[PDB]
Amino acid sequence: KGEELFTGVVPILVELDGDVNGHKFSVSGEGEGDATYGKLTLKFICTTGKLPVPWPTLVTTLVQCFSRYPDHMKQHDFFKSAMPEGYVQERTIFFKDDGNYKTRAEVKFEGDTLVNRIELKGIDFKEDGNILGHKLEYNYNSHNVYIMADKQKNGIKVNFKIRHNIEDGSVQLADHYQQNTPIGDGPVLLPDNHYLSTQSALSKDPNEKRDHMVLLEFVTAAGITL
Ligand SMILES: [Ca+2]
Ligand SMILES: [Ca+2]
């Protein structure tokens, strides 16, 4: 059963290849997750030089199996139920009055390590918009991630609105639409409607000269009562 894989601290690896308006880049991340506490700690490095988009815009793309599901909601945890074989996670992310990301990721175990491998494609960005113009603050807001079953794909459909602070005090909306499908043919938990409540803190390693992001995140499932 997939839930038993997450009772302790699990090492995480993230690998992303991206192309945003023809700017090609790669990101590698390492850290660990402790789903008992809904906790993630990770450090990401841009391995190709300078990241051509703001780090915050990649947070959602860069492992919802580490969410804390309350005991009374554990029959609604799709993400862990798909493990260890994993799931495909696909998104379209529409940046208001700007371009979009489309992403396809596979999240699964490689031995004891939870791996997220992603291909990201961004098109229609404005050269001097908030994304390619690097006008977004280095911080991150707290969100609600809404989950429902998608029975005909044997998976889930997920929607939410990310709010990225702009350096002028305004907000850059990033509308997220997501689909997750299991990779194995084994049974998964197709959940009742509920949501995940997220919080993330971004920081820098004062000794790191590469372009990077340190992330501490807590996520708790909610919306189904005792
Ligand atoms: Ca700036
Ligand atoms: Ca039900």
Numbering used by the authors: 3 to 64, 68 to 231
Manuscript excerpt for this entry:
The crystal structure of wild-type GFP (wt GFP) revealed that the chromophore is packed within the core of the GFP β-barrel structure protecting it from quenching through water dipoles, paramagnetic oxygen or cis-trans isomerisation. EGFP has greater folding efficiency (increased fluorescence due to a higher proportion of correctly folded protein) at 37°C, has a single excitation peak at ∼490 nm and has been codon optimized for expression in mammalian hosts.
The crystal structure of EGFP displays the traditional β-barrel structure with the chromophore located in the core of the protein. The most obvious effect of the F64L mutation comprises the exchange of the bulky and buried phenylalanine side chain for a smaller leucine side chain in the central chromophore containing helical structure. Val29 shifts closer to the chromophore upon the additional space being made available by loss of the aromatic Phe64 side chain. The hydroxyl group of Thr65 now donates a hydrogen bond to the backbone carbonyl of V61 instead of Glu222.
